[PDB]
């Protein structure tokens, strides 16, 4: 057996750990799929490249309301797929080389890793290795309902849909999460009619109810939305696919995209042989120092975190990287803890949505004395420039102190507009201070935040 | 003579002064032109409404770089003018109503006001009034070169160009400031040929040298740029206008736009009769209490401020309004001081520009030990989604402390992207904390700021 000071399962956020301070130690990296993890190859980055092209198309079909006449002649889907992965694939693959060929003290294994012992890992390549410390960066994988993975019909996930040969005439999406609603926006804007099937009574059910409700009402005018009904059976009739719901409705289309959720891959690693505890949802249990229940074993990313988000896994990687070099199970004094406090999320759909902190419901359930202002985009000068009638910025702050508790933006550049709120929240800045203690450029999209704060009572 | 507790010259930011705390006080408002001041009617608001339509036109003409085929059929200038001012004039006039219709104890004068005495004001309507306190909100007026306003040729300024009946085939602009380059962006994107004549060797001379330099290179590939030689004569040959420069070049076109700068309106008020001091360029002299040299008189806005910016003038009104109600010339303890420190500016041209703090030159001339990072838009995942090759985020931070001293962004949504820097600066937030002490949404335009901070040397 080959011994290492460090073994890393997962080339996602796991690849960000080895830097200069580790040069004197030999590292083993295990990657069963594409190099670079879900984020680079089939997730955050390539998705938003399609979203951008879809937003350009939306600009064109709506240009009349601004007094500019234009026609959307067509979309070259193949050339879009060509352009996106024409940049993604050389990058994923350039890093794979770096780790296996420059490899100053690194060894890459291309197999499914599995714990056979304490720090004993079957590589899936026919080898077994040992490590002084191990980091689990196994991420998550799409959840496929049994009704789909038994019918025998062709279905898609984020792992292949972005590489379709042609644009589907009718896309049927199973799911109401951010993956489903982002793909609905991408495809519908480019020319596909999208049908979305949701189990819940709203799309993006788990967001603030005012955001979830209004987006659903806007979505109903853009896509064929079917809520409240779980699917019951799937039937493939040639190239056409039919999906039967519990209420009896049958949704037929060209391509079936499954986006019902993601499952952390901890259950695939044989963690029981390593003494790594799994909780009730399949995430590996770690502490504020990302140290698991097992010695010398850390975890990060979708395999452990409650927020299956890249910027979270990257933050935790900074913590693991530092805690890796000290006396982890001996000295907590030199250890850094992970800050899981003001985690933002974004949905790149139309309208685009971003959040951070608590929903208004969550604020009241905690029994908080709050003030709330929902500011309309079309009420600031920049919102008029856009002739906006959908955008809102809802800020929930606390009465008396002005301590902001949450912010929810639905509208253009939502993931960027919220950043001043993320910033003020993360550093304890009061809302009355954020409004008046700085200048806001007039007139820019930013002014919606300022007026949201100015409309807040105390 | 009619006596008042307060007289206000200027319906721009001056109209924002009377609130609830003045209900028991009689107020006189003097406005010689259109109600609402420059920003609402011929300035801040209507320009950015045109700029957005120009961004729609640009999106369509460049959309193929994303794999979307579209044609710019035409531009409906008349329909642009109606849509912009179709909401602007009912608002200006709705506000004119409110002050004469709600008017609890307020009187509006539509005439050119001039100080004839201490606090004695000729209304320009044939009356003379006095007030216990006076606020000057007279703003500024366009500067017209003598060669232009003597030639007898028809010329336009920002006060009428947005009300042209038709789109000019070839627009000739005299100026290199933010007004010239915003209008250069507006017309060229909509179909006009644009010639820009600047006396300087760069457009936007007053920006960070790297920002001004790259923007000029980009402008030169979009417009007919004439640098380094001042104009000498203007001669009209029918409807066509020809402008001769000092080097001998003659730039001819159909429409002449003058955008060389603005002059504060202090010189027109007969101010010496009031003992209100004017400095060396014509702004009314005030202190941190917006107090002029004469008792009972304040000033604000473009008529006094060094920053002829709306968000500044609105802030100064907040100070004047509060200090108006106390004994400013007796007890400074209860008074509001104006914060003129982290004033941002933005130019809504192609590419969009925003700045705050110190330029690299200003930082070095001030003898600070600085570090600089110029981050390109196309280096974060969102820059790939746009296929950006022009955007930059330049951050100037101090070595050792990481305290930011300046930030300069050229690219999409520059006035919104920069706001986290304005905020972090305004509350003394360091780069080391701002970068890592908060979460940034992946992948959004915001990440360009994050990596700019990550690239700073200490
Ligand atoms: C469609 C989609 C869109 C997304 N959009 C966003 C977004 O906008 N913003 C955001 O912040 N996040 C987004 N995410 C989430 C982000 O892509 C991931 O959550 C992120 O990569 C988490 O990092 P990770 O390394 O833990 O996961 P991963 O990147 O999946 O890393 C896990 C790695 O381990 C490997 N592995 C698994 N099992 C084995 C084994 N047995 N042996 C060897 N190797 C193995 C996998 O091949 C993979 O390379 C998105 C995800 C998806 C699917
Ligand atoms: C084209 C353009 C674009 C701009 N864009 C921006 C931008 O994006 N952001 C920004 O922050 N700033 C911008 N500005 C600057 C902005 O217009 C000013 O900073 C702001 O309007 C200052 O407000 P004010 O009330 O002091 O000036 P004004 O709005 O001009 O108010 C002065 C008013 O007083 C009246 N008046 C003058 N003299 C007399 C008199 N003797 N008697 C009676 N009434 C009188 C005038 O008619 C006018 O209505 C722009 C300016 C222009 C010209």
DSSP summary: helix tally of chain A = 13
Q: Which range best describes the helical content of chain A: under 10%, 10-25%, 25-40%, 40-55%, 55-70% or over 70%?
A: 25-40%
Largest interface: A-B, 76 and 76 residues
Largest sheet of chain A: 7 strands, mixed
- Computed over alpha carbons, the radius of gyration of chain A is 24 Å
> How many strands in all of chain A?
23
Using the coordinates shown, work out and report the CATH topology of the largest domain in chain A.
FAD/NAD(P)-binding domain
Bound molecules: flavin-adenine dinucleotide
- How is the quaternary structure best described? homodimer
- What is the CATH homologous superfamily assignment of the largest domain in chain A? FAD/NAD(P)-binding domain
CATH A-level architecture of the largest domain in chain A? 3-Layer(bba) Sandwich
The chain-level structural class of chain A is alpha/beta
Structural domains of chain A: how many: 3
Overall shape of chain A: globular
